[PDB]
Amino acid sequence: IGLVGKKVGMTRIFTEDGVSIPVTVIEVEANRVTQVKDLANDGYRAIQVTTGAKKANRVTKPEAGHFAKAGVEAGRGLWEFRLAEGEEFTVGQSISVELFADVKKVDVTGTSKGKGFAGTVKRWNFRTQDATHGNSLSHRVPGSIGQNQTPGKVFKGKKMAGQMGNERVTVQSLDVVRVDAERNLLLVKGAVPGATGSDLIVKPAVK
Amino acid sequence: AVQQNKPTRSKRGMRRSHDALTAVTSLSVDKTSGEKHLRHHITADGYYRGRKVIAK
Amino acid sequence: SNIIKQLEQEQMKQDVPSFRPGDTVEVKVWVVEGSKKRLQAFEGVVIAIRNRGLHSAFTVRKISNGEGVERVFQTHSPVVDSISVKRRGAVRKAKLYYLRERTGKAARIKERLN
Amino acid sequence: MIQEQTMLNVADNSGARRVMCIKVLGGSHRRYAGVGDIIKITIKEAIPRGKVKKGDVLKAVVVRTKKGVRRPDGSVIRFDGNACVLLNNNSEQPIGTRIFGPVTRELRSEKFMKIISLAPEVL
Amino acid sequence: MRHRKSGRQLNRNSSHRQAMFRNMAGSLVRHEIIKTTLPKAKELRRVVEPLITLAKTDSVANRRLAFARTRDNEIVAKLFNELGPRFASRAGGYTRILKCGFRAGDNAPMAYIELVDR
RNA sequence: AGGACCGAACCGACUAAUGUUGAAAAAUUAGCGGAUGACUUGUGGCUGGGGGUGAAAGGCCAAUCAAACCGGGAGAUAGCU
RNA sequence: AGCGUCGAGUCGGCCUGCGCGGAAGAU
RNA sequence: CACAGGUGGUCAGGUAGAGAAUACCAAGGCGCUUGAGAGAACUCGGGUGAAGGAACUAGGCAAAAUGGUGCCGUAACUUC
RNA sequence: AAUUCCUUGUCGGGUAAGUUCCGACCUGCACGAAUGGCGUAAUGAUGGCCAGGCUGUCUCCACCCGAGACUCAGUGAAAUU
RNA sequence: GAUGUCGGCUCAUCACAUCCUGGGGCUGAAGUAGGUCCCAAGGGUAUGGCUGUUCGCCAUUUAAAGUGGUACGCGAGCUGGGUUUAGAACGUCGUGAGACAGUUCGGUCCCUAUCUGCCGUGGGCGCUGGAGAACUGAGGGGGGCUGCUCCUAGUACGAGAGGACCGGAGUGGACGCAUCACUGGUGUUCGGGUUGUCAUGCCAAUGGCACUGCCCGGUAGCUAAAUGCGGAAGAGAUAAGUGCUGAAAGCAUCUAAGCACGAAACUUGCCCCGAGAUGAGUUCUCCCUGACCCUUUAAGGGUCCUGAAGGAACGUUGAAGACGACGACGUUGAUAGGCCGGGUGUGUAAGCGCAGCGAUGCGUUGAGCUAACCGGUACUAAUGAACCGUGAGGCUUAACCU
Ligand SMILES: C=C[C@]1(C)C[C@@H](OC(=O)CSCCN(CC)CC)[C@]2(C)[C@H](C)CC[C@]3(CCC(=O)[C@H]32)[C@@H](C)[C@@H]1O
Ligand SMILES: [K+]
Ligand SMILES: [K+]
Ligand SMILES: [K+]
Ligand SMILES: [K+]
Ligand SMILES: [K+]
Ligand SMILES: [K+]
Ligand SMILES: [K+]
Ligand SMILES: [K+]
Ligand SMILES: [K+]
Ligand SMILES: [K+]
Ligand SMILES: [K+]
Ligand SMILES: [K+]
Ligand SMILES: [K+]
Ligand SMILES: [K+]
Ligand SMILES: [K+]
Ligand SMILES: [K+]
Ligand SMILES: [K+]
Ligand SMILES: [K+]
Ligand SMILES: [K+]
Ligand SMILES: [K+]
Ligand SMILES: [K+]
Ligand SMILES: [K+]
Ligand SMILES: [Mg+2]
Ligand SMILES: [Mg+2]
Ligand SMILES: [Mg+2]
Ligand SMILES: [Mg+2]
Ligand SMILES: [Mg+2]
Ligand SMILES: [Mg+2]
Ligand SMILES: [Mg+2]
Ligand SMILES: [Mg+2]
Ligand SMILES: [Mg+2]
Ligand SMILES: [Mg+2]
Ligand SMILES: [Mg+2]
Ligand SMILES: [Mg+2]
Ligand SMILES: [Mg+2]
Ligand SMILES: [Mg+2]
Ligand SMILES: [Mg+2]
Ligand SMILES: [Mg+2]
Ligand SMILES: [Mg+2]
Ligand SMILES: [Mg+2]
Ligand SMILES: [Mg+2]
Ligand SMILES: [Mg+2]
Ligand SMILES: [Mg+2]
Ligand SMILES: [Mg+2]
Ligand SMILES: [Mg+2]
Ligand SMILES: [Mg+2]
Ligand SMILES: [Mg+2]
Ligand SMILES: [Mg+2]
Ligand SMILES: [Mg+2]
Ligand SMILES: [Mg+2]
Ligand SMILES: [Mg+2]
Ligand SMILES: [Mg+2]
Ligand SMILES: [Mg+2]
Ligand SMILES: [Mg+2]
Ligand SMILES: [Mg+2]
Ligand SMILES: [Mg+2]
Ligand SMILES: [Mg+2]
Ligand SMILES: [Mg+2]
Ligand SMILES: [Mg+2]
Ligand SMILES: [Mg+2]
Ligand SMILES: [Mg+2]
Ligand SMILES: [Mg+2]
Ligand SMILES: [Mg+2]
Ligand SMILES: [Mg+2]
Ligand SMILES: [Mg+2]
Ligand SMILES: [Mg+2]
Ligand SMILES: [Mg+2]
Ligand SMILES: [Mg+2]
Ligand SMILES: [Mg+2]
Ligand SMILES: [Mg+2]
Ligand SMILES: [Mg+2]
Ligand SMILES: [Mg+2]
Ligand SMILES: [Mg+2]
Ligand SMILES: [Mg+2]
Ligand SMILES: [Mg+2]
Ligand SMILES: [Mg+2]
Ligand SMILES: [Mg+2]
Ligand SMILES: [Mg+2]
Ligand SMILES: [Mg+2]
Ligand SMILES: [Mg+2]
Ligand SMILES: [Mg+2]
Ligand SMILES: [Mg+2]
Ligand SMILES: [Mg+2]
Ligand SMILES: [Mg+2]
Ligand SMILES: [Mg+2]
Ligand SMILES: [Mg+2]
Ligand SMILES: [Mg+2]
Ligand SMILES: [Mg+2]
Ligand SMILES: [Mg+2]
Ligand SMILES: [Mg+2]
Ligand SMILES: [Mg+2]
């Protein structure tokens, strides 16, 4: 399983041998198990967890009853982790960042920053046409988008302008630099998706 | 670029299926003056949330 | 924020000397050549300081063996063993990038006498 | 950060004074050579009696760049100019017998240990 | 993108915006209530409230800074002699915006902005 | 002194971008050439269509030119659509 | 045929029916 | 067309400047008859750019650059 | 060669590399002496070639300021079919 | 009664007769390195000089610089060098007008997208009581490149020269995703210097205008040149190929029965989308437990009472965004602005005093000012309401329970 945390920001760790390690600081507060899914009832094995806190007035009655069944305080959301065969958890159990104490590498999933409507230069690394040499109104435009009468259409998946970012992204195989159970911190080497303050899912590296 | 065929009255109506205006959901009632007003806006007689904020 | 400041504070050197742009500084840096670790001196004019807590840096310019060289030191790096001010310089600007176009007599900085 | 058409100074006594990069070696579409990379050069200016002549095509190792080198703590070393040391086209061994100006620790490898030894300082 | 950026362009260049807010700040200090568009009113708070803050400490230097930013000695005098004193014990929030419907000529959303103790 | 030189007005129109259902049926913007001369400009006059005028491009002769425009022969003729 | 053994068929041409390979192309 | 065009003459302030150039002003005249927001792609008109420096391209097209006054100094060639 | 088809002739120069350029050669497909020959200082918004400087021309684009584009209110076209 | 043309640029997409990388048979294959044929389309597959060139030659790279189809792909996407209007000239032909699949210099590239398609993004209704969430994963998409060095090993092989397979370790190129801690760019919203001029009565101090007047620095954000990460391993079923056992055919035979190996192709594994998957799925939680009248007795129609869960709307807004959407917050409140403290940047304000004939210098003083930053703080604005959404949810059959 993994844990849900929050992107605090980036910093560095200086080692004694004069290496500066760029780190993302992830705040991983206790993940509380809100539901256990099993083959009999659900058709698959998973835990649902919450973390953090929500204000009572923003917790709906359906949400509150779900948390009350588990006997946990309302957190800011719900997330599931699939269980492997040996993994067993109970409802109401708190899972802390000490989970990662002996984990060497993690995959980190977040929502990437939102670039809004992006052109083909930015979105797909298209090359610009001439800035000069007679170019008429066609500096960052996409160029040709197809052939001719055969096939007489544009193919699906054609790279074009559109919404960029603000999507789920996983970065794989990041080194765990430090697990600090006292401060609820996980330090991972390198950048992870999303803005400061965004939710992160951290799992032991699949590869 | 221009149409090769005249679009129908049917297609015109379909495009305009999103053009309908939306009425103000409800008006608020000032606690003092009893005047109807747009919510979070002052009344026509210069009241807001029971206070004469604007004279005339 | 408070979290990062705490992580940064515990790594910060506590005995970094005061220096300013225009000062001549000698920076002693660790050089690891096999098992041998030794101090190498880099002495020159401070042309830029970036004050940014743990991420503070400063740029030292020297003319070395007929060639202009600039080193940007990361102030709190353990590679930097020591910093000493050799001469206090009197300049107006924060950033002395104008010295890159100057050599010899034209590149002299007046001593700051106070 | 040297590319095709970049002019370099010469950090040796080969006789070359100015050389131009005509190829960044060591991969398809490889854009740039930094400190310690081997480039193909043409000699654009040489002193009357040296080991090399204007128009000769040979190799060089880049030893100083304006873009500079990054160290593992995040530090940078930048030079005022781009400079290289001419190498024999086949052997990739220095043509000259003296090295002028500082070089960097990036050259401390088996291939370039001669340059390190001749250099007046290594940064 | 405009991530984390502050300030409204208001379909003007920088010199026009600066001049307009200097004029409008003067108008609000003089009259104590003005009607303008809602976005201009929201921007005006960021110009006027720092002038009032500056005016809490009467010195030659502060009067000159106020004069540099308003270019009106009637406004400077009112800031230092009336408004600074009136707001001495108030920690910001010297103005209030009251939305007041839509302008006839262009349907612009309008608001009154006033000094809070008017 | 000068079909002299640099350069505004003034007269032009080499390049580029824009514009191309234009702001404009030929322009705008940045640059560009001439700028006391074979210069430029106001007012008025004269030359008329196989005719004029042309430092000559078949250029120009009222947004029209390898034969103007208007009216007439005239419902030319059309083995073509 | 395989190893004198050995114990029933065996051998290879012709004619003809139906198949097999020969057989790589672009939305 | 209440149209970025065309249209001869006259008048000629201040500071800086060789100047009727140019900048800022005076007298005087105007803000150009849709506005309000927003701060995507892309287009137009502009500013800045690491390292490189014509590798761009039909072509350095465009851009960047040079730019004043005084003095020193200035080659081939020449119809002097 | 503003002329040369064969042709990117050949040789030399310049470049790492030069169908262009410059200098030669003569094999002038098909120069040539007032429908002038060969030169020629100066001049040219003239054609070709090279170099220094310079740079977003480019490697390879990034950010920013403005006008549109987008949304709201008012007015309200067009080609085509 | 018009189907825009060479070449380039931009953007491609398919075939496989494969250029590289992968697998394999034969070799006149010792090794290294080749030759040739078979399998294989996953991914990858030069920059320049010359020329309008495509091509080609040349220089220098690369694992390689594939061959073709796509209106000789792509001008309602760009260019306009070539070519093919009107000007002009040369050679040539012609008495001449003129002409040339000869040359030469110059020479207008329009279109606001209705439909299809494609990239994005919403609204509607559906999914059978309504609602808030978490999911399953049919299906779809992305990704899939490779060098060099070292070790194995100077081993195997070889007369020597040279010099491996297999397997292991490292470090790169190109490409891609993310990010802003660092290095930097930008930073007309921050600070400063400075030219001309006009103004604020004047001095002093400031402001306007001159491209942000010109400049020097630079916060946040955005960002690449910055720095993290990726391609895989593994599995299944195979290609060419290699076999085991094995008859038909006493032998032989990889094949007929039976069994085993076998590649970047295929199916998975990795990443993303995904129940309009109308075949509309699952799980958890929440909400509603009132009367009566009428007729065309019916999944009928209406009246009174009731109005839930939740939603929407409005407001303050956001590292979300064209608009919609999405997220945060609305006083029981840090949602935005202000304010306070800090940081950062700039670089010692003004005023006063002192020194100097003065420009100016020095002191007060690392001063003053300081955006988008950090930590805080109800001062201002986020309103009591109102609005939508209802009142136990069809029939049949089975099983279980009354
Ligand atoms: C005017 C016709 C053009 C635009 C161009 C035409 O090219 C020619 O006709 C070349 S000969 C005429 C050249 N020029 C006048 C001297 C006019 C373009 C060319 C390339 C073809 C050879 C004939 C067919 C074509 C349509 C498709 C095409 O390739 C075109 C026509 C129908 C097109 O309208
Ligand atoms: K006539
Ligand atoms: K000839
Ligand atoms: K003659
Ligand atoms: K003559
Ligand atoms: K010439
Ligand atoms: K192709
Ligand atoms: K083979
Ligand atoms: K392939
Ligand atoms: K065609
Ligand atoms: K074309
Ligand atoms: K078309
Ligand atoms: K177009
Ligand atoms: K259609
Ligand atoms: K950064
Ligand atoms: K920055
Ligand atoms: K001034
Ligand atoms: K569903
Ligand atoms: K959206
Ligand atoms: K606040
Ligand atoms: K001082
Ligand atoms: K002072
Ligand atoms: K300071
Ligand atoms: Mg965004
Ligand atoms: Mg390009
Ligand atoms: Mg055009
Ligand atoms: Mg353009
Ligand atoms: Mg079809
Ligand atoms: Mg038709
Ligand atoms: Mg509509
Ligand atoms: Mg903000
Ligand atoms: Mg506007
Ligand atoms: Mg200005
Ligand atoms: Mg003259
Ligand atoms: Mg003329
Ligand atoms: Mg002009
Ligand atoms: Mg002249
Ligand atoms: Mg002149
Ligand atoms: Mg003619
Ligand atoms: Mg005419
Ligand atoms: Mg006639
Ligand atoms: Mg008749
Ligand atoms: Mg007729
Ligand atoms: Mg008008
Ligand atoms: Mg007019
Ligand atoms: Mg005139
Ligand atoms: Mg003027
Ligand atoms: Mg813009
Ligand atoms: Mg510029
Ligand atoms: Mg800047
Ligand atoms: Mg640059
Ligand atoms: Mg530079
Ligand atoms: Mg240069
Ligand atoms: Mg070139
Ligand atoms: Mg090229
Ligand atoms: Mg030019
Ligand atoms: Mg310029
Ligand atoms: Mg020829
Ligand atoms: Mg030739
Ligand atoms: Mg060249
Ligand atoms: Mg030659
Ligand atoms: Mg010649
Ligand atoms: Mg002749
Ligand atoms: Mg004769
Ligand atoms: Mg003659
Ligand atoms: Mg002649
Ligand atoms: Mg409208
Ligand atoms: Mg037709
Ligand atoms: Mg094949
Ligand atoms: Mg396939
Ligand atoms: Mg595969
Ligand atoms: Mg080529
Ligand atoms: Mg074609
Ligand atoms: Mg093709
Ligand atoms: Mg076009
Ligand atoms: Mg087309
Ligand atoms: Mg052409
Ligand atoms: Mg002609
Ligand atoms: Mg795919
Ligand atoms: Mg990269
Ligand atoms: Mg930062
Ligand atoms: Mg910087
Ligand atoms: Mg400023
Ligand atoms: Mg003064
Ligand atoms: Mg003024
Ligand atoms: Mg003015
Ligand atoms: Mg057998
Ligand atoms: Mg591979
Ligand atoms: Mg500071
Ligand atoms: Mg000041
Ligand atoms: Mg001091
Ligand atoms: Mg502060």
Residue E1 lies in a domain: no
Quote the longest CA-to-CA distance of chain C. 49
* Shortest alpha-carbon distance between residue C68 and chain D (Å): 5
Please compute Rg for chain A using Cα positions: 23
Residue E64 lies in a domain: yes
Instruction: Collect contacts of A178-184 with beta carbons under 8 A, ≥24 apart.
Output: A178/A13, A178/A23, A179/A97, A179/A98, A179/A100, A179/A101, A179/A103, A180/A97, A181/A96, A181/A97, A181/A98, A181/A101, A183/C3, A183/C6, A184/A27, A184/A28, A184/A29, A184/A30, A184/A96, A184/A97
Is nucleic acid strand F under 7 Å from A134's C-beta? yes
If we measure between CA atoms, which residue out of E98, E95, E34, E92 comes closest to residue B51?
E98
- Chain D touched by C43 (CB under 8 Å): no
Is nucleic acid strand J under 7 Å from A175's C-beta? yes
Across the interface, whether the CB atoms of D123 and C74 are under 8 A apart is answered: no
Question: Rounded to 10 degrees, what is the CA torsion of B13, B15, B18, B21?
Answer: -60
Q: What's the CA angle centered on D106, arms D100 and D109, to 5 degrees?
A: 95
Return the number of other C-beta atoms located less than 10 Å from residue D58's C-beta. Answer: 20
Q: What is the resolution of this structure in A?
A: 1.7
Residue by residue, DSSP assigns A189-202 as: ES--SS-TT-EEEE
Across E94-111, b (16+ Cβ under 10 Å) vs e yields bbbebbbeeeeeeeeebb
How many domains in chain B?
1
Residue E80 lies in a domain: yes
Contacts of residue D94, Cβ cutoff 8 Å, sequence gap at least 6: D12, D14, D85, D86, D87, D88, D114, D115, D118
Q: Which residues surround the ion ligand 33 when the cut-off is CB under 5 Å?
A: E 15
Residue of chain D whose Cα is closest to the Cα of C34: D108
Across the interface, whether the CB atoms of B41 and E112 are under 8 A apart is answered: no
Across C60-88, b (16+ Cβ under 10 Å) vs e yields bbbebeebbbbbbbbbbbbbbeebeeeeb
Q: Is B21 exposed, middle or buried (0-12, 13-18, 19+ CB in 10 A)?
A: exposed
- Looking up tokens 């149409």 gives B3
Q: Which secondary-structure segment (H or E) carries B10?
A: helix B9-15
Which token pair is C40?
Answer: 């190498």
Per residue, the 3-state secondary structure of C68-81, as one string, reads EEEEEEECCCCCEE
Residue type at position A207: K
Q: Cα separation of E82 and E73, whole Å?
A: 13
- Looking up tokens 């009999």 gives A40
Q: Cα separation of C11 and A15, whole Å?
A: 10
If we measure between CA atoms, which residue out of E32, E30, E86, E80 comes closest to residue E60?
E80
| 3-class state of residue D84 by DSSP | strand
| 3-class state of residue A9 by DSSP | strand
Positive/negative CA dihedral, E37, E43, E47, E50? positive
How many domains in chain E?
1
Q: How many CA atoms lie within 13 A of A184 on its CB side?
A: 17
User: Pairing between strand C67-74 and D57-64?
Assistant: unpaired
Distance E55 CA to J25 C1' (A): 96
Across the interface, whether the CB atoms of C67 and D75 are under 8 A apart is answered: no
Across the interface, whether the CB atoms of A18 and D74 are under 8 A apart is answered: no
Question: Rounded to 10 degrees, what is the CA torsion of C60, C62, C65, C67?
Answer: 90
- Chain C touched by D116 (CB under 8 Å): no
Which token pair is D68?
Answer: 């500079």
The nucleotide whose C1' lies nearest the CA of A135 is J78
If we measure between CA atoms, which residue out of C86, C59, C80, C99 comes closest to residue C12?
C80
If we measure between CA atoms, which residue out of D72, D64, D15, D18 comes closest to residue D37?
D64
Return the number of other C-beta atoms located less than 10 Å from residue A5's C-beta. Answer: 28
Is nucleic acid strand H under 7 Å from E9's C-beta? yes
Q: Which secondary-structure segment (H or E) carries A111?
A: strand A105-111
Protein-proximal nucleotides of chain G (any atom < 7 Å from a CB): 27
Distance from the CA of E16 to the center of ligand 45, in angstroms?
28
Residue by residue, DSSP assigns E6-71 as: ----TTS-HHHHHHHHHHHHHHHHHHSEEEEEHHHHHHHHHHHHHHHHHTTS--HHHHHHHHHHH-
Q: In B, which residues are within 8 Å of E33 by CB distance?
A: 54
Per residue, the 3-state secondary structure of chain C, as one string, reads CHHHHHHHHCCCCCCCCCCCCCCEEEEEEEEEECCEEEEEEEEEEEEEEECCHHHCEEEEEEEECCEEEEEEEECCCCCEEEEEEEECEECCCCCCHHHHHCCHHHHCCEECCC
- Residue C88, domain extent: 1-114
Q: Cα separation of A20 and A10, whole Å?
A: 13
* Shortest alpha-carbon distance between residue E74 and chain A (Å): 47
Q: How many CA atoms lie within 13 A of C45 on its CB side?
A: 24
Distance D25 CA to J20 C1' (A): 19
Q: Cα separation of D64 and D85, whole Å?
A: 10
If we measure between CA atoms, which residue out of D122, C77, C28, D75 comes closest to residue A18?
C77
Residue E3 lies in a domain: no
Residue type at position C42: F
- Residue E100, domain extent: 13-115
Contact by Cβ (8 Å): A72, A30: no
Residue E108 lies in a domain: yes
* Shortest alpha-carbon distance between residue D23 and chain C (Å): 26
How many domains in chain C?
1
Residue C72 bridge partners (DSSP): C59, D76
Is nucleic acid strand J under 7 Å from A147's C-beta? yes
Residue E106 lies in a domain: yes
Across A132-155, b (16+ Cβ under 10 Å) vs e yields eeeeeeeeeebeeeeeeeeeeeee
Contact by Cβ (8 Å): E79, E29: yes
Contacts of residue C69, Cβ cutoff 8 Å, sequence gap at least 6: C44, C61, C62, C63, D77, D78, D79, D80, D102, D123
Residue E6 lies in a domain: no
Contacts of residue C80, Cβ cutoff 8 Å, sequence gap at least 6: C27, C28, C29, C73, C74
* Shortest alpha-carbon distance between residue B4 and chain E (Å): 38
Please compute Rg for chain B using Cα positions: 22
Across the interface, whether the CB atoms of E3 and A113 are under 8 A apart is answered: yes
Which token pair is A198?
Answer: 């965004």
- Residue B11, domain extent: 1-56
Residue A174 bridge partners (DSSP): A106
Q: Cα separation of C4 and E76, whole Å?
A: 43
Question: What distances in angstroms separate CA A44 from CA A34, A37, A41, one per listed residue?
Answer: 16, 6, 8
